[PDB]
RNA sequence: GCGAGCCUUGGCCGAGAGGUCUUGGUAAAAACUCCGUCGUGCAACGAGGAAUUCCUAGUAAGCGCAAGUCAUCAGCUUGCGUUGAUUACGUCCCUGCCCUUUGUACACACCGCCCGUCGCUA
């Protein structure tokens, strides 16, 4: 068959929502850029949209992004802004270019994400800490092999100098380790934490340290045998990161107090006074905090997904904090927080998620209004069939009546509830409505327009339907999802003794049970064929169901993690999968195969609807947004050749007027062969070789022994290969001539002899001396 | 223990009993592959007493049934012939893939053990070629009655799937004369 | 050296069944050794290509005999007897398969910690 959805990394997504800030990196001066789940660009002190970095169609590239989901670590701009680098949740450090939104290189070796990205005051080093607990020094080629420097077992915070060598560290592990540049050695490790570094700065001379023990150390830059020079104890919690005035004349510090405080004679204490603030420091603990580039204002990141502005006390800036800005967004981050339920229209162009305190209006990206009366966030959410008004259930049992063109709530529907709406659906002309509650009975409710005495506006509460007391070990009384015929004949409905019942307009009959179930149920639907139908329990497993009982068609079991929403298609031909698990896949109704599996989620999914449309696909989230869809012996003359090529060249060097084997001196690839080699059948190796093999043999062996090196060899070695050539051949049946290596020889075994000699006598000595007082201890 | 095989036919041989004899000549590491010029010889029990080996095989033909695979156990002296059904033409082969000193795990079907059971001794004497004590291959011998089959069997397995592979010629034979041996 | 170790012509006698005599077509130890004579036309495929297989002594090849059904001819089969070369006596190079040592992303589970949902009670 056919079946929409595309595995390209865009299908005009909105999916980004740029909230959740941990850091940021200033700009041109008059403009920040913002760590976010995409690159933003905002004004650094007025809050609009200036510019967004995401995903969708890059000048030259197909399914190329201009920044990722799977919230960005670190995020800053070079120093002459040429080049842009983030480094992701994934391993891979993204280059950006700062004009377009291309991809200069790719950057990997990481077993983990990125804990420190940081440019050089160089710009032809970058530096990345990672969570692999070590360090990677980049390059513009891309240098990996400069610098490696692990002794750690996590990760790491304190860095560089400016200086281009003398580097310095602080670790997560509760380390200070120090390293020179040109051969790292550590030196000395400086220990004070027992915990995890949260932040760290220098402030010009001062290296300060911000750990678990909610104190603070100073220490000096020239350091040798610890400098230290005072603590500063308890500012109340553990402290979480500071920051300097880029004037250098005063240090802020925050913590996860919700308190943030500057040091000024900077001093070893605070010395300012501090009533003159009036947009107090913080609701929420914040992660990072940067002075502005208007020497003006402060720049605060928190954790409240979303960053602000303020400003610190003194005469030089404002000497108070003004009311924090907000860049423009589309109304998906200028509200609070996370989309439980969705609601679709039969228009296109209203479609409506709900949070803790809004209700957004959309039509495809754009938005229109909000509404708000929000008491919570909204288990379900359900227009009228034509978009006229919408119907909502927050978690208080309270369905709330909003009309579509103001903010303004038009009825309260009457609170008959004790507790939180779990379903509600209406029927086709959209005046019953079925809800979900634990108060053992099945609500139905009025709607028309109010011009008489039943309030269709207030949905008076005439029919009662209560039987719920059937008898179970699991949950007597409680419903998770009600479904409405689509033929308008009967009503389906979630039980907790893991069965569903059907029964149909009127008072109660009963026409079906289904059971099986392991776990109980979360969603039920029906097909508008109206045969067969699907369950979807909290096992991980998917049953389809026609009219039979106890017959198992199929159970639909490949998952992992929990069952969101699984739904069938408009036209009922395509049911598809949310799961806990951050992937959204699609099956065949008529099948029991898939045909695409979609997997570009990387937060949770909560709800996904699709439209009778079919084109789009809306979806709720835990990021509160919606992704849119559509042999030997012969190395042995070699050496030889090689080595007696060496010291026949090195002879005549200057007495009269090749990069590898391996040393310094070519001898010792000499004797690593014979370190290589195993101590069987080695002499199958020796037997080969000629006389001309010794002749440039023995030379080596007057070298070692000018030498005087035993490191890399040893006697017994040089004397068994020397035993064997004497029994192959020979002395005087490959010469009967005296030459200069025969005359060699008479000294080389000399030193031989007496150098195995110093040793035997060392024993010699050594045994007897051990034997005597061991004849008096007695 | 383990058995020691040699292969003997009389002195002019066929094509669709060469490639015959060269499947069973993949029976090693003990088993000799060896053509005589005479059709008999009046002193395989001299050579078999000096090598020190334990079975002989002999094929030939006859007409009242067709061919037969001849099993002789040296130490005891018994007689069992196999009536071959399909000798026309097997495949050229001499080995495909491992080895013969692999041990197969061994399956018997259509359980005979009244009579048959004379049958279960030499073949768990024959076939226990190879002390690997480990299974790669496994060869089956299905019954039918007086009916035997002899099928080679690789372990083939994917995505939890118990296959085999039919490999080696296929053989059909039935139990033609057992004379009854001596205890000696 | 294994063995025993068929269609009819015609004729004389007989009620009979048949018996008996002629005629004519059809069927059905070897190699070796010696001694003498002659000296290649094929009517038609005329020592058999691509390719492929097998083979280490009494073995390959060659030759004949006998048997089972035969007193009688397998396009069958099994035994028997005679003569009897050449080449490897290897190696682990290719190829293929085993057994040991060696190397490792991945990985039951145990430590501490972060993040997110909901909620208790003081």
């Not at chain 1, 004004?43 to 970095?53: A, Q």
Request: proline residues 3%; hydrophobic residues 40%.
């Amino acid at each position: 068959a056919a079946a929409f959805g595309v595995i390209a990394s865009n299908a005009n997504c909105v999916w980004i929502p740029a909230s959740s800030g941990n850091s940021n990196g200033s700009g041109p001066g008059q403009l920040i850029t913002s760590a976010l789940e995409d690159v933003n660009i905002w004004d650094i002190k007025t809050g609009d949209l200036v510019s967004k970095l995401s995903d969708g169609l890059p000048p030259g590239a197909s399914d190329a992004r201009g920044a990722k989901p799977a919230e960005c670590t670190y995020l800053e701009a070079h120093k002459d802004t040429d080049l842009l680098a983030v480094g992701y949740a994934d391993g891979v450090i993204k280059v950006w270019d700062l004009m377009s939104k291309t991809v200069l290189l790719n950057f990997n070796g990481h077993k983990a994400a990125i804990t420190l990205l940081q440019f050089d005051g160089t710009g032809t080093r970058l530096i990345s800490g990672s969570k692999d607990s070590n360090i990677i020094v980049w390059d513009l080629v891309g240098e990996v092999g400069l610098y490696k420097l692990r002794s750690h077992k996590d990760s790491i915070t304190g860095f560089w100098c400016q200086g281009e060598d003398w580097l310095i560290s602080t670790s997560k592990d509760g380390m200070i380790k120090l390293w020179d540049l040109k051969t790292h050695q550590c030196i000395e490790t400086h220990i004070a934490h027992t915990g995890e570094c949260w932040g760290l700065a220098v402030k010009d001379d001062l290296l300060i340290t911000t750990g678990t023990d909610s104190q603070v150390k100073i220490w000096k830059l020239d350091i040798e045998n610890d400098k230290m020079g005072g603590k500063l104890t308890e500012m109340g919690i553990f402290e979480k990161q500071s920051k300097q005035r880029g004037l250098k004349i005063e240090f802020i510090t925050n913590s996860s107090d919700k308190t943030s405080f500057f040091y000024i004679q900077y001093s070893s204490f605070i010395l300012h006074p501090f009533q003159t603030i009036r947009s107090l420091y913080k609701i929420k603990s914040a992660s990072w905090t940067t002075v502005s580039s208007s020497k003006l204002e402060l720049v605060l990141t928190t954790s409240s997904n979303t960053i602000e502005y303020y400003s610190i006390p003194y005469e030089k800036r404002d000497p108070t904090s003004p009311a924090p800005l907000k860049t423009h967004t589309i109304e998906l981050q200028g509200q609070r927080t996370d989309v439980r339920s969705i609601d679709i229209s039969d228009d296109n162009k209203l479609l409506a998620t709900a949070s803790n305190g809004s209700l957004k209006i959309w039509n495809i990206k754009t938005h229109k209004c909000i509404r708000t009366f929000e008491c919570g966030y909204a288990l379900t959410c359900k227009f009228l069939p034509g978009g006229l008004l919408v119907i909502l259930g927050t978690r208080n049992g309270e369905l709330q009546l909003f009309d579509l063109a103001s903010s303004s709530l038009l009825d309260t529907i009457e609170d008959a509830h004790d507790a939180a709406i779990w379903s509600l659906d209406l029927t086709s002309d959209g005046k019953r409505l079925v809800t979900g509650s634990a108060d053992k009975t099945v609500k139905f409710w009025d709607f028309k327009v109010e011009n008489s005495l039943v309030p269709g506006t207030k949905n008076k509460f005439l029919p009662v339907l209560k039987l719920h007391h059937d008898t179970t070990l699991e949950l007597t009384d409680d419903i998770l999802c009600v479904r409405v015929s689509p033929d308008d004949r009967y009503l389906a409905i979630s039980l907790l003794d893991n069965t569903v019942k059907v029964f149909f307009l009127d008072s109660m009959k009963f026409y079906l049970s289904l059971y099986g179930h392991k776990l109980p149920v979360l969603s039920i639907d029906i097909s508008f064929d109206s045969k067969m139908i699907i369950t979807s329990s909290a096992d991980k497993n998917i049953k389809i169901w026609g009219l039979d009982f106890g017959d198992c068609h199929k159970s639909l079991f490949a998952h992992q993690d929990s069952i969101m929403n699984v739904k069938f298609l408009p036209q009922s031909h395509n049911f598809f999968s949310c799961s806990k698990d951050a992937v959204v896949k699609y099956w065949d109704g008529e099948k029991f195969e898939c045909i695409q599996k979609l997997y570009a989620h990387q937060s949770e999914v909560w709800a996904l609807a699709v439209a009778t449309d079919g084109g789009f696909v809306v979806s709720s989230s835990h990021d509160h947004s919606i992704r849119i869809w559509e042999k030997a012996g012969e190395r042995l003359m070699e050496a030889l050749d090689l080595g007696i090529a060496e010291i026949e060249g090195l002879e005549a060097y200057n007495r009269d007027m090749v990069l590898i084997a391996v040393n310094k001196t070519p001898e010792q690839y000499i004797m690593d062969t014979l370190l290589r080699i195993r101590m069987s059948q080695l002499e199958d190796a020796l037997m080969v070789m000629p006389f001309s093999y010794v002749l440039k043999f023995l030379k080596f062996i007057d070298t070692v022994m000018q030498n005087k090196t035993l490191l890399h060899s040893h006697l017994p070695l040089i004397c068994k290969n020397l035993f064997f050539i004497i029994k192959f051949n020979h002395k005087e049946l490959v010469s009967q001539k005296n030459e200069e290596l025969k005359l060699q020889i008479n000294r080389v075994k000399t030193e031989l002899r007496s150098a195995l000699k110093s040793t035997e006598d060392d024993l010699g000595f050594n045994v007897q001396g051990l034997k005597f007082v061991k004849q008096q201890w007695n | 223990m383990d058995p020691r095989i040699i292969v003997t036919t009389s002195r002019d041989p066929s094509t669709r009993l060469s490639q015959f004899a060269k499947e069973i000549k993949l029976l090693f590491p003990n088993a000799v592959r060896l053509n005589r010029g005479n059709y008999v010889m009046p002193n395989l029990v001299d050579a078999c007493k000096k090598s020190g080996t334990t079975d002989l095989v002999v094929l030939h033909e006859h007409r009242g049934v067709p061919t037969s695979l001849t099993i002789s156990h040296f130490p005891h002296g018994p007689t069992a012939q196999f009536s071959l059904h399909n000798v026309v033409m097997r495949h050229d082969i001499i080995n495909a893939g491992n080895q013969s000193e692999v041990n197969p795990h061994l399956i018997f079907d259509n359980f005979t053990t009244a009579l048959g059971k004379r049958v279960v001794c030499i073949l768990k004497h024959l076939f226990n070629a190879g002390p690997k004590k480990d299974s790669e291959r496994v060869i089956t011998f299905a019954n039918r009655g007086d009916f035997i089959s002899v099928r080679q069997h690789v372990y083939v397995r994917t995505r939890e799937g118990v296959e085999i592979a039919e490999v080696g010629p296929r053989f059909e034979m039935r139990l033609f004369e057992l004379r009854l041996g001596t205890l000696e």
